Design a binder for this molecule. Structure first.
Ligand SMILES: *[C@@H]1O[C@H](CO)[C@@H](O[C@@H]2O[C@H](CO)[C@@H](O)[C@H](O)[C@H]2NC(C)=O)[C@H](O)[C@H]1NC(C)=O
Ligand SMILES: *[C@@H]1O[C@H](CO)[C@@H](O[C@@H]2O[C@H](CO)[C@@H](O)[C@H](O)[C@H]2NC(C)=O)[C@H](O)[C@H]1NC(C)=O
Ligand code: NAG
Ligand code: NAG
Ligand code: NAG
Ligand code: NAG
Ligand code: NAG
Ligand code: NAG
Ligand code: NAG
Ligand code: NAG
Ligand code: NAG
Ligand code: NAG
Ligand code: NAG
Ligand code: NAG
Ligand code: CUO
Ligand code: CUO
Ligand code: CUO
Ligand code: CL
Ligand code: CL
Ligand code: CL
Ligand code: CL
Ligand code: MG
Ligand code: MG
Lengths: 655, 229, 207, 229
């Protein structure tokens, strides 16, 4: 139903405005205390708390009341007898629900209904461009639009640069703003949380707590690789909550209801949130005690159930037993926690503490900061400090686990060779083997699906928004393996990436690399015949991607951020390959279990007696450690042959 | 400032306290909830924000807290000894009992403090004006975040901010410091030929069937409307 | 014997006090040595224990291990005849112990705390052994000098150019670096064979 | 700095720590016990003295801690992105693999940091030189007490002060920060036609009836005398 997709459009306009523009038949109307749909008492009675969230504020995904409202609205959508009825219900309620809550419920519905595919949802920036584009640019667009219409011009393009949201020369954190503010990355974050909401009916996801850990671990690890590429120090956890948050953030964003997002000054304390009403408050020492309780459970190897029984934590579970990493994840997020009263709601509330830290006692009648919303939170540098803390809790748990045994790491298949080759991307240049590039390229999208730029009904106006994105050429890799047995063997290849050196230029040991490994590709191969086989994978096939400014749809790691930036001189990365005996992997599938019984990120999330990744891999014929160089190009044409006349002489052989 | 304090007393608030120890964060922030016609929302100031060095762009245009403190030290000295030093090297007496053709000391201090036509910009500086800008930029004093100024930076908006009155209580304190150095008015300076015998105050008619008792004034809230077009 | 719990003189009352203690089973060790000379040689065996890994799971180097080495047994043997000899010591004979809730009397490292707790999964320790040429050792003897001229804890209280304990030991044929696992049992009976019927299936080979 | 550290290790002292967090007081003071030929005794610095804004006489000649910090921020940025901004607006690449006729990045950073022939005084400032003066005047940074400078203010005396080496460890850290941005030397850049086969070091004769073993060097204290007249 492409009529279904239309429901995502013009979210700040009335249903009448949308229907009129789109020729959608409306149900009966009335005048609210302007033209609004009549809301059937029968529908209303089914809506639970959906209507309790007032218009004119964002959907605050980490807040329990807001999430309950999205859950309650989506329930009606998901349970509708047919897609026709779904559309009818959506059209009818649209005027009566908070628009962000409406949108969130609709995206969640595509994940939850079996007859809908998340890949068919519109790209989020085309629906809510105000979440991704600076206030000044949207306002400039409104001006350019008004002029265009007057001068009979049906199309306008506006654009912007990072130089306009902060000053890199005085703010090192701004050097990585292009990545944190990447609209596809922020959209991925929204999709992840709506595919895997912590408020989901328990059991309707498999290992959701573990996936919470795993996706965010990869998100933090890749951010750090971007930081190293930029000569920044890796992110530091925000763990001592007595210390003010050193780096503030001014998002320069304004919602379609004209509500500018709150900012956070440098050196702002993480403070008790005294809510309105006061009985709904939460406190720093409360979160600290939840943390103390959780650290205790992790350290002794079991959690206490609210029913009084003890639950063992293990990543070597019995058949039918939960994974310890999953139990910790559900307790920490929190989602389906074994004991809310004891372990609390640390991660979600922390978003809200940070998001309200500019006015924590609600004295000043202000809005929340971007940490309060899933589609904006990644923009804030403190997101990654908060998630480094969260990943530290998970790593604390992982370290309590015994190293994988020889049997747990053994395999029938031998890995013999690994090669990586960048595809053709510019005439008269062929990339050397094992070298990948990144560079910046513009992308443009049509924002008129999200914002009505018309002055009056008959105006024909389209506003395109153009901006720069990190990008990389396609690449492929080939793994050479040997099956020395007498029959066909199927295997899963597990490929991970990490920088070789830390910020000090020191080779990272095995223990340090555990905090960095990120999924490149994890997939099952065709059965391998006895003898040698070559397995070739293209970068577009990667397990971390799903299936025009928006290459991959639904829930996907951004294709354009698939390769860490790297450096001008070339930055060296480990490329770990393991052959193990037998729709982004970061997102999982709502209706199916995780097929692989091994913990996510296996085997590179446990301690080893081996000091180095080299020593570890050398112990196992089914593992090989390859190495690639990643080089960022300020000017992609620089790879081309230059006129002999224009080449300059080097003083020291190379220059 | 005086009338503000009368309003505070009317509301059971304590009189405003000068912001004088600039190493103490400004306790009360202010969120103006204002946006200019160019779509530019005015910056706010969180509670407990420090008064900090303003590192301008370009950096050579910067000003510093201890710089303002030294201007203050110099001005306090001049007030306390009863003369300012002119940039031309000569001393200028401060007195509110001036000779014919002599400036008033209160005027000289005012020009030095604002500052306007200061006798010595290099020595006494520009305390009051720059103070507005320090407070108005205190949410982002090193200009790292590409932000707008707060309302203390503009004359048509600065009075909105509670810190306006803390800043002006400091300023009034400087002026009162100077006033206290002056000798009391002499009998001759206060004497007059006219005797005052009586005083009465009477509120005019404003509501039918009520006549205000003598020496009683009222206040109340009333709506007003204007054409914004 | 310590508190008089009698109300009046003629009362016959005994108060027993019961509580839990860490404990360990007896153990023995055997050192195989060679005397390649032509006459009998007497030696002192010096045996020390330290964890292999720090709290971060990183292998501790020589310098870090210096802060951890603890005496297991330091004692003189009978003279060793030319050729190979086996020297076996029981844990109750340890130099750190002296000679019923109170196993060893006088001044003694507690026998019940002779073995570090260890972990449920098993915790790995270095077991360093040195053969040197020639009443708890922690307490000394009031009336006698320390018999051994070497500093207490020798040789593992000084710096070395060697980066690891492995490298250090490899330099010296009279030193060997052994390794033991120490495992704490929440329920000691857990080591027993369980009914085939009651065994649960593991997802990942072990559980 | 490196040789000082070797002397420290020889004495069972910890290697010198950079003075980089300028919010923290300088722990170790220094009393030089020196007096010039004009009878002017050099100022000392007590233990635990803060690095503070220098309010000069005249005040317009002052410099400020946060000013130096912003110069440092600007320089760290240039180092991290691999180029400096010229006062003429153009960008200058930093590289220790220069083209023929191109300056060395380490040289450009040095001229900017000292500062000497800086590409952009207004942006990168005069960090190292002014730091000597901040430290040398830290006993009386607002010039209230009519005092002389400490030994950090003069090249023939500055090395005496332990803080010299804390300041220079900071300076060397900036330079090392830059060096780390450079790619490792390539095989060709390190290759050579000559093979080194052996090295031996031998102390010469210095005392009768002793010959130093190979590869052993000695130090000791000896008196020296000079004519001060
Ligand atoms: C930009 O996006 C919007 C999609 O919302 C397009 O607007 C539609 O255009 C068609 C063709 O004129 C109309 O029939 C629809 O009514 C429009 N939809 C809405 C909601 O207004 C627009 O065409 C796009 N512009 C371009 C160049 O593709
Ligand atoms: C518990 O300890 C005390 C030792 O002090 C024992 O008390 C003695 O018991 C004997 C036998 O009845 C008496 O003759 C002594 O007079 C007691 N000594 C004192 C100081 O009271 C007691 O017997 C012990 N109980 C047991 C069960 O062994
Ligand atoms: C609006 O303008 C576009 C070109 O920008 C044109 O293709 C389209 O036909 C116009 N719409 C109408 C209804 O005329
Ligand atoms: C508590 O919940 C767990 C979940 O498996 C269950 O096994 C156990 O029986 C419960 N405890 C009690 C005493 O109800
Ligand atoms: C190899 O294949 C056999 C037969 O399927 C299987 O039992 C075994 O687990 C596989 N792996 C290893 C390491 O033996
Ligand atoms: C691996 O592949 C590369 C390039 O294809 C080749 O040069 C190298 O020799 C191979 N190594 C092995 C062990 O086959
Ligand atoms: C990979 O995806 C990108 C973006 O969609 C596309 O440009 C490219 O052609 C794809 N490569 C292949 C061979 O599918
Ligand atoms: C400084 O200016 C004042 C102006 O009132 C003047 O009276 C005085 O003579 C001047 N000083 C000198 C020495 O020029
Ligand atoms: C009253 O008036 C006289 C005459 O004008 C005047 O000179 C004098 O200043 C006044 N005297 C008093 C009592 O103040
Ligand atoms: C002043 O006027 C008031 C009221 O008009 C009156 O009460 C009082 O007697 C008068 N006082 C004198 C001295 O006239
Ligand atoms: C070691 O001492 C303990 C406690 O006294 C005792 O139970 C055990 O029997 C002793 N072992 C031997 C063989 O002496
Ligand atoms: C700035 O100075 C550099 C020094 O080499 C010079 O190359 C460049 O042309 C100058 N920039 C301009 C625009 O004058
Ligand atoms: C060796 O000598 C040749 C001849 O001068 C020269 O070209 C070369 O650079 C030298 N070094 C090496 C490492 O080849
Ligand atoms: C180096 O010199 C020393 C002393 O002269 C000598 O003992 C040693 O054998 C030499 N090594 C080689 C490789 O010639
Ligand atoms: O959770 Cu994905 O934002 Cu903290
Ligand atoms: O001056 Cu301070 O605002 Cu009238
Ligand atoms: O510079 Cu700092 O003293 Cu040689
Ligand atoms: Cl309340
Ligand atoms: Cl400041
Ligand atoms: Cl500047
Ligand atoms: Cl001055
Ligand atoms: Mg912290
Ligand atoms: Mg420091």
């Amino acid at each position: 139903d492409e009529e279904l997709r239309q429901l995502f459009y013009l979210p700040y306009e009335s249903t009448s405005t949308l229907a009129d523009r789109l020729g959608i038949q409306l149900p009966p109307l009335e005048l609210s205390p302007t033209a609004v749909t009549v809301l059937d008492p029968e529908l209303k009675a089914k809506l639970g708390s959906a209507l309790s969230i007032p218009e004119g504020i964002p959907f605050f995904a980490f807040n329990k009341q807001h999430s309950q409202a999205v859950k309650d609205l989506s329930k009606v959508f998901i349970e509708a007898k047919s897609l026709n009825v779904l559309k009818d219900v959506a059209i009818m309620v649209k005027d009566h629900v908070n628009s962000a809550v409406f949108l969130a419920a609709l995206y969640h519905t595509y994940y939850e209904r079996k007859d809908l595919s998340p890949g068919d949802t519109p790209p989020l920036p085309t629906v809510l461009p105000d979440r991704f584009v600076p206030t000044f640019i949207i306002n400039k667009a409104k001006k350019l639009a008004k002029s265009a219409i007057i001068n009979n011009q049906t199309e306008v393009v506006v654009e912007w640069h990072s130089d306009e949201t902060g000053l890199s020369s005085r703010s090192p954190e701004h050097r990585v703003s292009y990545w944190r503010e990447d609209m596809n990355l922020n959209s991925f974050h929204w999709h992840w949380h709506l595919s895997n909401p912590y408020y989901i009916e328990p059991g309707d996801r498999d290992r959701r707590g573990e996936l919470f850990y795993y996706m965010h671990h990869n998100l933090v690890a890749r951010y750090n690789m971007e930081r190293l590429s930029l000569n920044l120090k890796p992110v530091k956890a925000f763990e001592d909550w007595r210390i003010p948050v050193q780096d503030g953030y001014f998002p320069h964003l304004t919602t379609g209801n004209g509500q500018e997002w709150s900012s956070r000054q440098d050196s702002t304390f993480f403070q008790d949130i005294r809510e309105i009403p006061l009985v709904d408050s939460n406190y720093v020492s409360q979160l600290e005690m939840w943390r103390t309780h959780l650290y205790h459970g992790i350290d002794v190897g079991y959690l206490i159930h609210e029913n009084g029984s003890y639950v063992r934590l293990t990543d070597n579970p019995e058949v039918g037993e939960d994974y310890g990493i999953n139990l910790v994840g559900e307790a920490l997020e929190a989602g389906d926690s074994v004991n809310p009263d004891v372990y609390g709601n640390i991660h979600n509330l922390g978003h809200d503490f940070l998001g309200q830290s500019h006015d924590p006692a609600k004295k000043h009648s202000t809005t929340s900061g971007v940490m309060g919303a899933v589609e904006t939170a990644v923009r804030d540098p403190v997101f990654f400090r908060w998630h480094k803390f969260i990943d530290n809790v998970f790593h604390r748990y992982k370290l309590t686990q015994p190293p994988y045994t020889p049997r747990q790491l053994s395999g029938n298949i031998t890995v013999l060779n690994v090669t990586v080759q960048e595809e053709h991307w510019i005439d008269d240049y062929v990339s050397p083997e094992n070298l990948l590039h990144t560079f910046f390229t513009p992308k443009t999208f049509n924002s008129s699906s999200g914002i009505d730029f018309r002055l009056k009904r008959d105006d024909n106006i389209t506003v395109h928004i153009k901006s720069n994105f990190l990008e990389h050429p396609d690449f492929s890799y080939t793994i050479t393996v040997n099956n020395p047995t007498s029959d066909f063997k199927r295997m899963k290849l597990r490929i991970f990436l990490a920088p070789k050196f830390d910020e000090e230029g020191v080779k990272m040991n095995y223990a340090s690399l555990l905090r960095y490994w990120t999924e490149v590709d994890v997939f099952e191969t065709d059965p391998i015949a006895p003898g040698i086989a070559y397995i070739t994978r293209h970068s577009n096939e990667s397990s971390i991607l799903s299936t025009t400014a928006f290459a991959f749809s639904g829930c996907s790691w951004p294709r354009n951020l698939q390769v860490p930036r790297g450096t001008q001189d070339g930055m060296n990365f480990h490329f770990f390959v393991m052959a193990t005996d037998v729709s982004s992997s970061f997102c999982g599938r709502p209706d199916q279990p995780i097929p692989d019984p091994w913990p996510m990120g296996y085997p590179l999330e446990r301690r080893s007696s081996k000091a180095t990744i080299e020593d570890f891999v050398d112990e196992h014929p089914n593992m090989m450690l390859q190495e690639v160089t990643i080089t960022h190009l300020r000017d992609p044409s620089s790879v081309l042959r230059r006129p002999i006349s224009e080449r300059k002489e080097c003083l020291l052989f190379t220059c």
